[PDB]
Design a binder for this molecule. Structure first.
Ligand SMILES: O=C(N[C@H](CO)[C@H](O)c1ccc([N+](=O)[O-])cc1)C(Cl)Cl
Ligand SMILES: [Mg+2]
Ligand SMILES: [Mg+2]
Ligand SMILES: [Mg+2]
Ligand SMILES: [Mg+2]
Ligand SMILES: [Mg+2]
Ligand SMILES: [Mg+2]
Ligand SMILES: [Mg+2]
Ligand SMILES: [Mg+2]
Ligand SMILES: [Mg+2]
Ligand SMILES: [Mg+2]
Ligand SMILES: [Mg+2]
Ligand SMILES: [Mg+2]
Ligand SMILES: [Mg+2]
Ligand SMILES: [Mg+2]
Ligand SMILES: [Mg+2]
Ligand SMILES: [Mg+2]
Ligand SMILES: [Mg+2]
Ligand SMILES: [Mg+2]
Ligand SMILES: [Mg+2]
Ligand SMILES: [Mg+2]
Ligand SMILES: [Mg+2]
Ligand SMILES: [Mg+2]
Ligand SMILES: [Mg+2]
Ligand SMILES: [Mg+2]
Ligand SMILES: [Mg+2]
Ligand SMILES: [Mg+2]
Ligand SMILES: [Mg+2]
Ligand SMILES: [Mg+2]
Ligand SMILES: [Mg+2]
Ligand SMILES: [Mg+2]
Ligand SMILES: [Mg+2]
Ligand SMILES: [Mg+2]
Ligand SMILES: [Mg+2]
Ligand SMILES: [Mg+2]
Ligand SMILES: [Mg+2]
Ligand SMILES: [Mg+2]
Ligand SMILES: [Mg+2]
Ligand SMILES: [Mg+2]
Ligand SMILES: [Mg+2]
Ligand SMILES: [Mg+2]
Ligand SMILES: [Mg+2]
Ligand SMILES: [Mg+2]
Ligand SMILES: [Mg+2]
Ligand SMILES: [Mg+2]
Ligand SMILES: [Mg+2]
Ligand SMILES: [Mg+2]
Ligand SMILES: [Mg+2]
Ligand SMILES: [Mg+2]
Ligand SMILES: [Mg+2]
Ligand SMILES: [Mg+2]
Ligand SMILES: [Mg+2]
Ligand SMILES: [Mg+2]
Ligand SMILES: [Mg+2]
Ligand SMILES: [Mg+2]
Ligand SMILES: [Mg+2]
Ligand SMILES: [Mg+2]
Ligand SMILES: [Mg+2]
Ligand SMILES: [Mg+2]
Ligand SMILES: [Mg+2]
Ligand SMILES: [Mg+2]
Ligand SMILES: [Mg+2]
Ligand SMILES: [Mg+2]
Ligand SMILES: [Mg+2]
Ligand SMILES: [Mg+2]
Ligand SMILES: [Mg+2]
Ligand SMILES: [Mg+2]
Ligand SMILES: [Mg+2]
Ligand SMILES: [Mg+2]
Ligand SMILES: [Mg+2]
Ligand SMILES: [Mg+2]
Ligand SMILES: [Mg+2]
Ligand SMILES: [Mg+2]
Ligand SMILES: [Mg+2]
Ligand SMILES: [Mg+2]
Ligand SMILES: [Mg+2]
Ligand SMILES: [Mg+2]
Ligand SMILES: [Mg+2]
Ligand SMILES: [Mg+2]
Ligand SMILES: [Mg+2]
Ligand SMILES: [Mg+2]
Ligand SMILES: [Mg+2]
Ligand SMILES: [Mg+2]
Ligand SMILES: [Mg+2]
Ligand SMILES: [Mg+2]
Ligand SMILES: [Mg+2]
Ligand SMILES: [Mg+2]
Ligand SMILES: [Mg+2]
Ligand SMILES: [Mg+2]
Ligand SMILES: [Mg+2]
Ligand SMILES: [Mg+2]
Ligand SMILES: [Mg+2]
Ligand SMILES: [Mg+2]
Ligand SMILES: [Mg+2]
Ligand SMILES: [Mg+2]
Ligand SMILES: [Mg+2]
Ligand SMILES: [Mg+2]
Ligand SMILES: [Mg+2]
Ligand SMILES: [Mg+2]
Ligand SMILES: [Mg+2]
Ligand SMILES: [Mg+2]
Ligand SMILES: [Mg+2]
Ligand SMILES: [Mg+2]
Ligand SMILES: [Mg+2]
Ligand SMILES: [Mg+2]
Ligand SMILES: [Mg+2]
Ligand SMILES: [Mg+2]
Ligand SMILES: [Mg+2]
Ligand SMILES: [Mg+2]
Ligand SMILES: [Mg+2]
Ligand SMILES: [Mg+2]
Ligand SMILES: [Mg+2]
Ligand SMILES: [Mg+2]
Ligand SMILES: [Mg+2]
Ligand SMILES: [Mg+2]
Ligand SMILES: [Mg+2]
Ligand SMILES: [Mg+2]
Ligand SMILES: [Mg+2]
Ligand SMILES: [Mg+2]
Ligand SMILES: [Mg+2]
Ligand SMILES: [Mg+2]
Ligand SMILES: [Mg+2]
Ligand SMILES: [Mg+2]
Ligand SMILES: [Mg+2]
Ligand SMILES: [Mg+2]
Ligand SMILES: [Mg+2]
Ligand SMILES: [Mg+2]
Ligand SMILES: [Mg+2]
Ligand SMILES: [Mg+2]
Ligand SMILES: [Mg+2]
Ligand SMILES: [Mg+2]
Ligand SMILES: [Mg+2]
Ligand SMILES: [Mg+2]
Ligand SMILES: [Mg+2]
Ligand SMILES: [Mg+2]
Ligand SMILES: [Mg+2]
Ligand SMILES: [Mg+2]
Ligand SMILES: [Mg+2]
Ligand SMILES: [Mg+2]
Ligand SMILES: [Mg+2]
Ligand SMILES: [Mg+2]
Ligand SMILES: [Mg+2]
Ligand SMILES: [Mg+2]
Ligand SMILES: [Mg+2]
Ligand SMILES: [Mg+2]
Ligand SMILES: [Mg+2]
Ligand SMILES: [Mg+2]
Ligand SMILES: [Mg+2]
Ligand SMILES: [Mg+2]
Ligand SMILES: [Mg+2]
Ligand SMILES: [Mg+2]
Ligand SMILES: [Mg+2]
Ligand SMILES: [Mg+2]
Ligand SMILES: [Mg+2]
Ligand SMILES: [Mg+2]
Ligand SMILES: [Mg+2]
Ligand SMILES: [Mg+2]
Ligand SMILES: [Mg+2]
Ligand SMILES: [Mg+2]
Ligand SMILES: [Mg+2]
Ligand SMILES: [Mg+2]
Ligand SMILES: [Mg+2]
Ligand SMILES: [Mg+2]
Ligand SMILES: [Mg+2]
Ligand SMILES: [Mg+2]
Ligand SMILES: [Mg+2]
Ligand SMILES: [Mg+2]
Ligand SMILES: [Mg+2]
Ligand SMILES: [Mg+2]
Ligand SMILES: [Mg+2]
Ligand SMILES: [Mg+2]
Ligand SMILES: [Mg+2]
Ligand SMILES: [Mg+2]
Ligand SMILES: [Mg+2]
Ligand SMILES: [Mg+2]
Ligand SMILES: [Mg+2]
Ligand SMILES: [Mg+2]
Ligand SMILES: [Mg+2]
Ligand SMILES: [Mg+2]
Ligand SMILES: [Mg+2]
Ligand SMILES: [Mg+2]
Ligand SMILES: [Mg+2]
Ligand SMILES: [Mg+2]
Ligand SMILES: [Mg+2]
Ligand SMILES: [Mg+2]
Ligand SMILES: [Mg+2]
Ligand SMILES: [Mg+2]
Ligand SMILES: [Mg+2]
Ligand SMILES: [Mg+2]
Ligand SMILES: [Mg+2]
Ligand SMILES: [Mg+2]
Ligand SMILES: [Mg+2]
Ligand SMILES: [Mg+2]
Ligand SMILES: [Mg+2]
Ligand SMILES: [Mg+2]
Ligand SMILES: [Mg+2]
Ligand SMILES: [Mg+2]
Ligand SMILES: [Mg+2]
Ligand SMILES: [Mg+2]
Ligand SMILES: [Mg+2]
Ligand SMILES: [Mg+2]
Ligand SMILES: [Mg+2]
Ligand SMILES: [Mg+2]
Ligand SMILES: [Mg+2]
Ligand SMILES: [Mg+2]
Ligand SMILES: [Mg+2]
Ligand SMILES: [Mg+2]
Ligand SMILES: [Mg+2]
Ligand SMILES: [Mg+2]
Ligand SMILES: [Mg+2]
Ligand SMILES: [Mg+2]
Ligand SMILES: [Mg+2]
Ligand SMILES: [Mg+2]
Ligand SMILES: [Mg+2]
Ligand SMILES: [Mg+2]
Ligand SMILES: [Mg+2]
Ligand SMILES: [Mg+2]
Ligand SMILES: [Mg+2]
Ligand SMILES: [Mg+2]
Ligand SMILES: [Mg+2]
Ligand SMILES: [Mg+2]
Ligand SMILES: [Mg+2]
Ligand SMILES: [Mg+2]
Ligand SMILES: [Mg+2]
Ligand SMILES: [Mg+2]
Ligand SMILES: [Mg+2]
Ligand SMILES: [Mg+2]
Ligand SMILES: [Mg+2]
Ligand SMILES: [Mg+2]
Ligand SMILES: [Mg+2]
Ligand SMILES: [Mg+2]
Ligand SMILES: [Mg+2]
Ligand SMILES: [Mg+2]
Ligand SMILES: [Mg+2]
Ligand SMILES: [Mg+2]
Ligand SMILES: [Mg+2]
Ligand SMILES: [Mg+2]
Ligand SMILES: [Mg+2]
Ligand SMILES: [Mg+2]
Ligand SMILES: [Mg+2]
Ligand SMILES: [Mg+2]
Ligand SMILES: [Mg+2]
Ligand SMILES: [Mg+2]
Ligand SMILES: [Mg+2]
Ligand SMILES: [Mg+2]
Ligand SMILES: [Mg+2]
Ligand SMILES: [Mg+2]
Ligand SMILES: [Mg+2]
Ligand SMILES: [Mg+2]
Ligand SMILES: [Mg+2]
Ligand SMILES: [Mg+2]
Ligand SMILES: [Mg+2]
Ligand SMILES: [Mg+2]
Ligand SMILES: [Mg+2]
Ligand SMILES: [Mg+2]
Ligand SMILES: [Mg+2]
Ligand SMILES: [Mg+2]
Ligand SMILES: [Mg+2]
Lengths: 275, 48
RNA sequence: UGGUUCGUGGAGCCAUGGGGGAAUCUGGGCGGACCACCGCCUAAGGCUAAGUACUCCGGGUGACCGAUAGCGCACCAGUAC
RNA sequence: GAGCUAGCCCUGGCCAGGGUGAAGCUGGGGUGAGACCCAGUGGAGGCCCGAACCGGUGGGGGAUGCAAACCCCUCGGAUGA
RNA sequence: GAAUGCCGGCAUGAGUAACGAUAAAGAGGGUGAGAAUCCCUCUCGCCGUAAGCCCAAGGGUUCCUACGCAAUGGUCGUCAGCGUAGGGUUAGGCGGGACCUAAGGUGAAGCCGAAAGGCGUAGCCGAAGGGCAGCCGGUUAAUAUUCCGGCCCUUCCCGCAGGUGCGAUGGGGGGACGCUCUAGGCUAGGGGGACCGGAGCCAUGGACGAGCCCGGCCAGAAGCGCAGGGUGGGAGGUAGGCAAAUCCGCCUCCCAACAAGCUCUGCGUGGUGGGGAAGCCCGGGUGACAACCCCCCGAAGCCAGGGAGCCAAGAAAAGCCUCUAAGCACAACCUGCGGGAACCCGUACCGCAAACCGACACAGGUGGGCGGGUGCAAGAGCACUCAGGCGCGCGGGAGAACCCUCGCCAAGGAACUCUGCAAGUUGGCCCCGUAACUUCGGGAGAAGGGGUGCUCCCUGGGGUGAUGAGCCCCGGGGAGCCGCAGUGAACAGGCUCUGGCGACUGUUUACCAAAAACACAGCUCUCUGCGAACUCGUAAGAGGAGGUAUAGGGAGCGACGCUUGCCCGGUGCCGGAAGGUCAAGGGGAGGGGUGCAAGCCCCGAACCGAAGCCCCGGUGAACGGCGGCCGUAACUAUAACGGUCCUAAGGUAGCGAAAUUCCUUGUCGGGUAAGUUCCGACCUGCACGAAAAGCGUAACGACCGGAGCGCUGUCUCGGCGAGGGACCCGGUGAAAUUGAACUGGCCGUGAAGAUGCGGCCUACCCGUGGCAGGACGAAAAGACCCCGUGGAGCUUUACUGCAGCC
RNA sequence: CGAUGUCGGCUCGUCGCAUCCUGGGGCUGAAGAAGGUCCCAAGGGUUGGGCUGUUCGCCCAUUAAAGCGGCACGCGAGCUG
RNA sequence: UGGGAGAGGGUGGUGGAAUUCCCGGAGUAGCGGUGAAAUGCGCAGAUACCGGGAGGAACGCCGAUGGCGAAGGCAGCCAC
RNA sequence: CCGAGGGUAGGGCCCGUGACUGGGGCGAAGUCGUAACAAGGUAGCUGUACCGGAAGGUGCGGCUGGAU
């Protein structure tokens, strides 16, 4: 439930902020944080390799448990639900009866005080992790490993989820958040339910400064530049593209497909996304 | 207005100093060159 | 592909990045595509003075300069600046 | 060569005073319960006036300058990109 | 003898401009060969959120004292940041190192690259961040938290005593954190005192006073008091914290809980040790046995790791504490006390500047802290002043033009001009009051008004205290006084109406453009399934991202509202296992050379054989494009209607003489006495039009048009006055330029614009202040233009390659 | 072309006369008054506004009249821009 | 108090038929459509037939001249 | 002191008037087509939506004031 402001400044007219309703704890677990080295889009050569990055609010990285097949059979209590600035989803603090403390991505509907568990024999319940082959067909799932024991790669953003569509040998068929139909190996882990914080898509940044807070420096249009800079640069006055629209590096950018032809995972993608 | 020389002893020593010069192939050519020319100082003096 | 006088030329020879891949003298390379004949040579291991080059240094000599010349510097110069 | 300048990274510092008065909270009214209205409380904002600080709008001076971009008057921002 | 030649020397301009902020000077007395310029005294003026003081950087002896004045100093010089010489910088506690980590840099392992080298985990380096023990006063010509005095404290070594399972680079705790707002109690700092101390003073009409003037503290160990931070105790289980663990984490039970208890800071007190003014008399002495007290104001600093709210969600590591492992428990650790030990470097001085960056003793530039008082609503604003520091390193006269900065002005009041450019006006606070329109916030300080000093009298509430007095803070009513005028000086909006463009706050061409340009939230298309796409790199490796389609890249549009039409024939992109074309390679019909021959060697057809291209489709918020001629209505005119040609399809809505309209000052209306601009209409739109978006739109704008009111030296039309220059005298003394010059007017002539030729006219020699018509005056080997088989940036369906991708 | 600054305005003039006014005339389809047309005449004079960058032009209100040209389309080491 | 009929309303489950698309099979010269046609689709293998899968929407028979609601209106089945 | 009213500034209601623009009513014999009345030759009408020289057409849902 996004929160609105009255128009007492030009920008407050449109600004919207998250409700932070589900959050129950407002400082992070000290043994689960480490410093996040802001890059500013620079690589080890110091070169900008991703334009328009830098100058956002300082952040600490929260360590997230993307395996969970670490602790099979060991139940854990949902102790808190917290804000994570490194991702769109909220995160959940788990107190394992082991005594160990971990963080997971917070699924939709997960309540503080409930218990979750991971393993082949876990109850099909929101927040439980299982190898894909043991989840019933048609179960909405998230935080999906892509290859067995390699780590949850799929459906981690606020509100997203994949749905189990069927089985074939050692493999399951998932409809991904994008709508692609892909085979994923049945021993890959996943967590029942969809990621939480689904209202995240309807936040209205509201003003330029809000983009700056997030680390997003201003984006400059190619048509605003000069020919030394960009295919779309130059022209007396304003100008249309006057050529197939192009990136700064000359490649075409209105429909030109870019997945590499002979990729081995092609044998595992059934249907490309749609829409 | 603010001009272009803003002296800074650490900066001078870390940029042009002897150990900066020795670390790099071009730097050592500078020292060999200035020795062959017979310069009295191979490197800019900075009080440290 | 390079090297050679040889820039694809009738283009051999020497070298070799890729593929295929021998034999031990009755073996093998060369004589400018190739073939025959006639001859020359013995690859895929290594070393080897002297005659040749240069001039920081020393000395000898100039139909070489003589302080705006001769080295940037005859002098506390690769200095002052 | 980034001791000028541009961007980013790490770590510190600075922004007189005054003005406006959001949400929320509380009490009151209202209703089946509500929405909602009123008062007080509150102290939000690329909010307002204005020094420091950062600028450089108009005009005048200066023009072998005080200055290879300065001086006077005036003017923009001043809790935020 | 010339090359705007090179190097050097010396002229001209010229005793000219200038002598670097208009904060300002006068006199007396010293010194000396010499004095506006040095030293002393008195008077004057200037800064005082500095033009005073203290740190950091940078500079590197410039510091102090003696002796000097050739040069440096924009003049002078006896002076000096100058010359010569001598002296001067003192630390266990301040800063840095023998501690820690940040970005980053480096880098056993490892990875990569023709060579050089490029990466890289731990580790190591790296600070103005963390951590860590000293405060007040005195002393020197010159250093002082450093020397000395008083009172405190830290680490290391050894020993004594008491205590304990001691022990680490390992486990754990802690260190450890944002922005805004903010409580209580204090401290810094300040104001007042009829109280305490003090050398004196009585003037010129009055005052011997509850008079004037000066001052009334600082540091302090334990203890104590006030105020705050921090922190549950115990037991049982335990599989987690990469070994172990009694520690921590998880679970259960009892107890305690807005406390207390323990602990840790701040402030107060505190044995004791210091300081101590005016004035007077030579930095000193006296004052002085100085006194050292009460009240108020009160931080942004301190208690602090305090509290609340919010979203953009806010370093690390060591010190420290706890846990155990090897080990060892003659040890070792902890606590108390004692003796010993405690190193290296910096320390002078300048430091918003004459010592730093600007070639200069240069009106510029330079980070942190302190920055008093009174009044003005507040304040670091403004005026004046304290302490402290200065009068800016040429002066003396004169009182022209003209220039700069400043003041005033009769009548008029924008008539000035491209333009009200500039300058007036308005101007703070309190009260009354306030329009269209609107996104309901605003528009708004709208507009427009009234009040503002002083005296007396009556009175309401707060803070401190005690509830009172006193001091301090907000007010209310009534009566009076004076002036031209009461924010009496200084600081301090002119207003309104109406279009264009851009939503807005922001950003930009350092040094001619600040905008309508860029950005911006927001909208759409598109790529990307993660060893993602994409970017940098030969690579390794990075970024993307320790992210995962509510995400990341690319592109255009640009808040918001209402909308965004038709064309897929060409170009692009996307889809298409057919067909057509298609390289290396495979295949080998059939030929050829040579040999006696077995053979060796060369050419080689059908047929098979990728991507790409051809072909078939799709696709516009992909590149793009969206017609001509002729006829027609019962007045005329004009065509709802029709005919035909062409196209891939013939521009919809909305807007329109427009930031677009050539003819054009289109035509009509408005505003004006008069309007090529403006506003509103019309539509034959030379040449609008829908995300290179179309039409609107409240608020916003140092953007650009048009108008009105207010007020003005802008103007009719100029006048006067001020100061700094200009001018004159003394001192110091440039510059570009310069074939040489004994350098006039006219009308002609001349390479076509003559001081220099012809003819005539005019004209004694030489200066000084002024003005700019000429010397085709100076400056810069024309930027425009052309030429050169000159150059460089940029483009593409120019050529030819290369990366990259297939 | 080793530089002759280029529109308009402002300021400052000065000259020509093919004369706009004022002075002197002839002719008239000149009754008077007022004009028309030509001759002589350059002494003096020849206004203030609205629009536009404008020169020019139109318009408003007047006037004896609201002249036309040259001087590097006079004049930027005189100003504006 | 005790009974009843009902597509009355809200929420969440869930069942079969059909249409469309996708994969596999088998098969070949047309399919579709109309008044008649054409556009279109089809040898790059369509239509017609079989197995499999995905997804949305609506509930055949019961059904009525029926029922319920204040009206608008309410129809697979199940629970609250 | 109050005070006719004069002056200044800003609002509210009403009236007249305005380039141009919107539809409306009326007008013996204009141009275009044929929407409705019969099943009016696609039953009509309806709220709304979108489109078109014009009546109208089409979509969704409703009515019978629909015929056979
Ligand atoms: O170019 C200029 N003048 C040159 C003299 O060398 C010449 O007088 C000139 C002036 C104007 C011009 N024009 O207007 O076309 C042409 C040449 C000056 Cl604008 Cl710098
Ligand atoms: Mg809002
Ligand atoms: Mg609102
Ligand atoms: Mg939440
Ligand atoms: Mg940590
Ligand atoms: Mg990184
Ligand atoms: Mg690096
Ligand atoms: Mg590097
Ligand atoms: Mg990028
Ligand atoms: Mg970047
Ligand atoms: Mg993310
Ligand atoms: Mg989150
Ligand atoms: Mg898999
Ligand atoms: Mg979004
Ligand atoms: Mg951020
Ligand atoms: Mg963005
Ligand atoms: Mg942009
Ligand atoms: Mg551009
Ligand atoms: Mg550009
Ligand atoms: Mg470039
Ligand atoms: Mg290019
Ligand atoms: Mg390009
Ligand atoms: Mg272009
Ligand atoms: Mg352009
Ligand atoms: Mg442009
Ligand atoms: Mg254009
Ligand atoms: Mg355009
Ligand atoms: Mg184009
Ligand atoms: Mg392109
Ligand atoms: Mg590519
Ligand atoms: Mg896909
Ligand atoms: Mg600068
Ligand atoms: Mg610097
Ligand atoms: Mg330094
Ligand atoms: Mg430094
Ligand atoms: Mg440095
Ligand atoms: Mg370096
Ligand atoms: Mg160095
Ligand atoms: Mg080398
Ligand atoms: Mg030497
Ligand atoms: Mg060097
Ligand atoms: Mg060769
Ligand atoms: Mg050859
Ligand atoms: Mg080879
Ligand atoms: Mg043998
Ligand atoms: Mg042989
Ligand atoms: Mg042989
Ligand atoms: Mg051979
Ligand atoms: Mg041979
Ligand atoms: Mg041989
Ligand atoms: Mg051999
Ligand atoms: Mg041999
Ligand atoms: Mg030899
Ligand atoms: Mg010799
Ligand atoms: Mg000599
Ligand atoms: Mg010489
Ligand atoms: Mg000589
Ligand atoms: Mg020599
Ligand atoms: Mg020489
Ligand atoms: Mg020397
Ligand atoms: Mg720099
Ligand atoms: Mg501020
Ligand atoms: Mg107010
Ligand atoms: Mg209030
Ligand atoms: Mg609150
Ligand atoms: Mg603001
Ligand atoms: Mg205000
Ligand atoms: Mg500036
Ligand atoms: Mg300026
Ligand atoms: Mg001005
Ligand atoms: Mg200049
Ligand atoms: Mg200035
Ligand atoms: Mg000023
Ligand atoms: Mg201002
Ligand atoms: Mg302001
Ligand atoms: Mg402020
Ligand atoms: Mg000659
Ligand atoms: Mg010369
Ligand atoms: Mg020359
Ligand atoms: Mg010469
Ligand atoms: Mg020379
Ligand atoms: Mg010379
Ligand atoms: Mg000489
Ligand atoms: Mg000389
Ligand atoms: Mg002379
Ligand atoms: Mg002269
Ligand atoms: Mg001069
Ligand atoms: Mg000067
Ligand atoms: Mg001044
Ligand atoms: Mg005097
Ligand atoms: Mg004097
Ligand atoms: Mg003197
Ligand atoms: Mg003297
Ligand atoms: Mg003196
Ligand atoms: Mg002061
Ligand atoms: Mg120096
Ligand atoms: Mg001297
Ligand atoms: Mg002298
Ligand atoms: Mg001198
Ligand atoms: Mg000087
Ligand atoms: Mg003397
Ligand atoms: Mg000293
Ligand atoms: Mg000491
Ligand atoms: Mg040591
Ligand atoms: Mg190396
Ligand atoms: Mg280092
Ligand atoms: Mg270190
Ligand atoms: Mg440190
Ligand atoms: Mg210390
Ligand atoms: Mg101490
Ligand atoms: Mg002291
Ligand atoms: Mg001494
Ligand atoms: Mg912490
Ligand atoms: Mg932290
Ligand atoms: Mg910190
Ligand atoms: Mg914040
Ligand atoms: Mg104190
Ligand atoms: Mg006070
Ligand atoms: Mg255990
Ligand atoms: Mg403390
Ligand atoms: Mg005494
Ligand atoms: Mg502060
Ligand atoms: Mg604190
Ligand atoms: Mg670290
Ligand atoms: Mg043992
Ligand atoms: Mg023992
Ligand atoms: Mg112990
Ligand atoms: Mg040592
Ligand atoms: Mg010192
Ligand atoms: Mg300053
Ligand atoms: Mg100084
Ligand atoms: Mg320089
Ligand atoms: Mg000076
Ligand atoms: Mg004081
Ligand atoms: Mg004030
Ligand atoms: Mg002075
Ligand atoms: Mg001054
Ligand atoms: Mg005079
Ligand atoms: Mg002045
Ligand atoms: Mg005055
Ligand atoms: Mg007066
Ligand atoms: Mg006047
Ligand atoms: Mg007026
Ligand atoms: Mg007036
Ligand atoms: Mg005017
Ligand atoms: Mg004028
Ligand atoms: Mg202008
Ligand atoms: Mg204007
Ligand atoms: Mg004022
Ligand atoms: Mg109005
Ligand atoms: Mg209003
Ligand atoms: Mg208005
Ligand atoms: Mg409006
Ligand atoms: Mg409103
Ligand atoms: Mg007002
Ligand atoms: Mg009053
Ligand atoms: Mg008075
Ligand atoms: Mg009076
Ligand atoms: Mg103001
Ligand atoms: Mg703007
Ligand atoms: Mg703009
Ligand atoms: Mg716009
Ligand atoms: Mg807008
Ligand atoms: Mg702002
Ligand atoms: Mg500029
Ligand atoms: Mg520029
Ligand atoms: Mg420049
Ligand atoms: Mg400018
Ligand atoms: Mg511009
Ligand atoms: Mg601006
Ligand atoms: Mg821009
Ligand atoms: Mg914008
Ligand atoms: Mg979208
Ligand atoms: Mg690359
Ligand atoms: Mg690459
Ligand atoms: Mg990463
Ligand atoms: Mg915008
Ligand atoms: Mg928009
Ligand atoms: Mg833009
Ligand atoms: Mg744009
Ligand atoms: Mg097309
Ligand atoms: Mg097509
Ligand atoms: Mg196409
Ligand atoms: Mg086209
Ligand atoms: Mg339309
Ligand atoms: Mg028009
Ligand atoms: Mg327009
Ligand atoms: Mg146009
Ligand atoms: Mg026009
Ligand atoms: Mg025109
Ligand atoms: Mg007109
Ligand atoms: Mg009119
Ligand atoms: Mg027309
Ligand atoms: Mg476009
Ligand atoms: Mg609106
Ligand atoms: Mg507006
Ligand atoms: Mg603006
Ligand atoms: Mg602006
Ligand atoms: Mg007016
Ligand atoms: Mg004047
Ligand atoms: Mg004067
Ligand atoms: Mg003299
Ligand atoms: Mg001199
Ligand atoms: Mg001569
Ligand atoms: Mg002569
Ligand atoms: Mg002469
Ligand atoms: Mg003469
Ligand atoms: Mg001629
Ligand atoms: Mg002549
Ligand atoms: Mg003459
Ligand atoms: Mg002569
Ligand atoms: Mg002659
Ligand atoms: Mg002559
Ligand atoms: Mg003559
Ligand atoms: Mg004459
Ligand atoms: Mg003179
Ligand atoms: Mg003169
Ligand atoms: Mg002249
Ligand atoms: Mg002149
Ligand atoms: Mg001249
Ligand atoms: Mg000439
Ligand atoms: Mg001339
Ligand atoms: Mg020049
Ligand atoms: Mg040249
Ligand atoms: Mg030339
Ligand atoms: Mg030139
Ligand atoms: Mg030309
Ligand atoms: Mg050519
Ligand atoms: Mg030629
Ligand atoms: Mg060329
Ligand atoms: Mg080139
Ligand atoms: Mg290449
Ligand atoms: Mg020329
Ligand atoms: Mg010349
Ligand atoms: Mg010249
Ligand atoms: Mg008559
Ligand atoms: Mg005349
Ligand atoms: Mg003209
Ligand atoms: Mg005209
Ligand atoms: Mg007359
Ligand atoms: Mg003329
Ligand atoms: Mg002409
Ligand atoms: Mg002309
Ligand atoms: Mg001129
Ligand atoms: Mg000029
Ligand atoms: Mg001019
Ligand atoms: Mg000139
Ligand atoms: Mg001239
Ligand atoms: Mg077919
Ligand atoms: Mg076939
Ligand atoms: Mg579907
Ligand atoms: Mg009257
Ligand atoms: Mg007819
Ligand atoms: Mg019909
Ligand atoms: Mg009909
Ligand atoms: Mg019909
Ligand atoms: Mg019909
Ligand atoms: Mg239709």
């Amino acid at each position: 439930a996004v929160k609105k402001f009255k128009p007492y400044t030009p920008s407050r007219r449109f600004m919207t902020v998250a409700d932070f309703s589900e959050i129950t704890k407002t400082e992070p677990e000290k043994s689960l944080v480490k410093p996040l080295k802001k890059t500013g889009g620079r690589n080890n050569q110091g070169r900008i390799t991703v334009r328009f990055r830098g100058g956002g609010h300082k952040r600490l990285y929260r360590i997230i448990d993307f395996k969970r097949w670490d602790k099979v059979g060991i139940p854990a209590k949902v102790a808190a639900i917290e804000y994570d600035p490194n991702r769109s989803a909220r995160i959940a603090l788990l107190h394992y009866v082991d005594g160990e403390k971990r963080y997971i991505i917070a699924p939709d509907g997960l309540q503080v005080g409930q218990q979750v568990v991971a393993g082949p024999d876990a109850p099909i319940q929101v927040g439980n992790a299982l190898p894909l082959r043991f989840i019933p067909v048609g179960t909405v799932v998230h935080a999906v490993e892509l290859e067995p024991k390699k780590g949850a790669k799929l459906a981690r953003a606020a509100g997203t989820s994949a749905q189990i569509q069927g089985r074939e040998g050692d493999y399951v068929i998932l409809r991904l958040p994008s709508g692609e139909l892909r085979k994923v190996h049945g021993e890959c882990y996943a967590t029942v339910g969809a990621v939480g914080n689904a209202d995240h898509k309807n936040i209205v940044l509201g003003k330029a400064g809000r983009s700056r807070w997030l680390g997003r420096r201003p984006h400059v249009r190619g048509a605003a530049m000069n020919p030394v800079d960009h295919p779309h640069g130059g022209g007396e006055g304003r100008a249309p593209r006057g050529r197939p629209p192009a990136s700064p590096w000359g490649w075409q950018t209105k429909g030109l497909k870019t997945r590499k032809r002979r990729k081995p995972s092609s044998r595992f993608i059934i249907a490309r996304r749609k829409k | 207005m603010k001009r272009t020389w803003q002296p800074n002893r650490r900066k001078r020593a870390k940029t042009h100093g002897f150990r900066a010069r020795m670390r790099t192939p071009g730097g050592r050519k500078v020292l060999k060159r200035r020795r062959q020319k017979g310069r009295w100082r191979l490197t800019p003096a900075v009080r440290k």
